[PDB]
From a paper:
DMT1 is a member of the conserved SLC11/NRAMP family, which is expressed in all kingdoms of life and which constitutes transporters for transition metals such as Fe2+ and Mn2+. SLC11 transporters are monomers and their fold resembles the general organization of a branch of the APC (amino acid-polyamine-cation) superfamily containing transporters for amino acids and glucose. The substrate binding site is located in the center of the protein formed by residues in unwound regions of the pseudo-symmetry related α-helices 1 and 6.
For that purpose, we have soaked crystals of EcoDMT with Br-BIT and oBr-BIT and collected multiple datasets at a wavelength corresponding to the anomalous absorption edge of bromine. Whereas we were unable to detect bromine in the anomalous maps of oBr-BIT containing crystals, the majority of datasets collected from crystals soaked with Br-BIT displayed a single strong peak in the anomalous difference density at equivalent positions, which aided the localization of the bound inhibitor. In this structure, EcoDMT adopts the same substrate-free outward-facing conformation that has previously been observed in datasets of the protein in absence of the inhibitor. In this conformation, a funnel-shaped aqueous pocket of the protein leads from the extracellular solution to the substrate binding site. The inhibitor is bound at the base of this pocket as defined by the anomalous difference density that constrains the position of the covalently bound Br-atom and by residual density in the 2Fo-Fc omit map that was calculated with phases from a model not containing the inhibitor. The omit map of the EcoDMT Br-BIT complex displays density for the aromatic ring and for the isothiourea group located close to the metal ion binding site (termed proximal isothiourea group), whereas the other group (the distal isothiourea group) is not defined in the electron density reflecting its increased conformational flexibility. The aromatic group is stacked between α-helices 6 and 10 contacted by the side chains of residues Ala 231, Leu 410, Ala 409 and Leu 414. The distal isothiourea group is located in the wider entrance of the cavity and might thus adopt different conformations, which is consistent with its undefined position in the electron density.
Residue numbers in the entry: 13 to 506
The structure:
Amino acid sequence: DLSLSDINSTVEVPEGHSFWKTLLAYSGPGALVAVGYMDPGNWSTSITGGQNFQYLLLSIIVISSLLAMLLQNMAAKLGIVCQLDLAQAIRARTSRRLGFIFWILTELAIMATDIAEVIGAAIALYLLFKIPIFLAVVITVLDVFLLLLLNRIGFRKIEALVVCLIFVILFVFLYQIILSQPAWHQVAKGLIPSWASVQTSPKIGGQTPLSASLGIIGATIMPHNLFLHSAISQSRKIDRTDSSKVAEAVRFSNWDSNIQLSLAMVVNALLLIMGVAVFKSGAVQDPSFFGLYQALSNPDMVSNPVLAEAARSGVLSTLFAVALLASGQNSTITGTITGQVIMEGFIHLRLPLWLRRLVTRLIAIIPVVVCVAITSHQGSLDEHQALNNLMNNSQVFLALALPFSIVPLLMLTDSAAQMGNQFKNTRWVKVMGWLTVIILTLLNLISISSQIAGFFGDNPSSQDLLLSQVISIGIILAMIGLLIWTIIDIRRFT
Ligand SMILES: N=C(N)SCc1cc(Br)cc(CSC(=N)N)c1
């Protein structure tokens, strides 16, 4: 009847005032969430923003990282304090019908992340092992056995394995930046929160600063990682009777998550400065993973003689495919964990890790294999671009499910009926939290129509444009209705 009954309150080792050694024990939950923020679903958008506004959007990365840290800290606090995950809190403060709606929505969000992971991983297979595109997908489907072997390891090592993957994809891109020898003075200048980023004056590659900046901002949090954090934060036993120990545990999880998400922000910055320093101005014409592979494998695309020699030696691209693999391994873990969390919390369905990963991977690869079928039937022509378009269209479910995950979390963490007058949110975070929640919900409701219209490709059918407008208005109004319903229920609780 409690979240993650298998590893809930497993190891609690806070000894005296030796926080650091204690810090070393529970450092796992942060990495599991951070690694999700390093998925290839936005690798191109970082390199693209870099080429279009070199070292300019680096401050937006920092701000988005700060906001994600804020919301993930709120989720970890809810988990730590109430000894229950966000799904459970929401399902208990709301009817089964809304619980089921949220369940399906977050299933679709984790499935979109899984589609991105499978596409990136199958393409990484294609590139590294030259496995046929269609076989790389059916090979990635074999991650259920990797999950079986992963089940017997334990979180002291599983979370360390996630840290291993994190540093893998981090050093892969830091090595190529070390060889680039970029102008770190312009990097520090970009990291400042300048107003050039919010302006609309430059229009490089049909992308203005305000557009790329707002996209980074709206793309701040991942709804499934909220639930993941509120569930994994309970893996450390807490007495829930000593305010000093619970406030200490809050500091623990905060420092952990902030380290890990800082690692993630550093990875995003590395992607941006990768697009700026490594690649030549506008060299990247194909955002696809294959596009970036050949661009890193073509010496005329780099901006340094050393990088030219290395790219001709065919290393930069291989390290990129490796990072693709390291990033696609994330879903197998976190998607399963978070999906189990959301099932067992929203619909009270106890399923094993066997049939979970199976159904998720199948539903994810269905569209992938359909896309591959259609493109290879047109002759593997634009097959990688079509895969990237699928990857990017999948990301609409995240916009669909984000409010129904952030508004409830903020409400339940601010209410004393859930946290008490001692551990509720400060007046400081009350303002920042609500501001960020409003901003993101607005941006995502906006992006709903953009994505729905992008479903019809870059060919604007006049009759299909009005249909897209109708569908988008309907979806945004339905989300508005669901949001006000959830607000009413939660405020009735509080
Ligand atoms: N890195 C990832 N796996 S998701 C980044 C992200 C998160 C949300 Br939430 C919404 C969007 C789409 S924002 C748009 N419609 N332009 C993107």
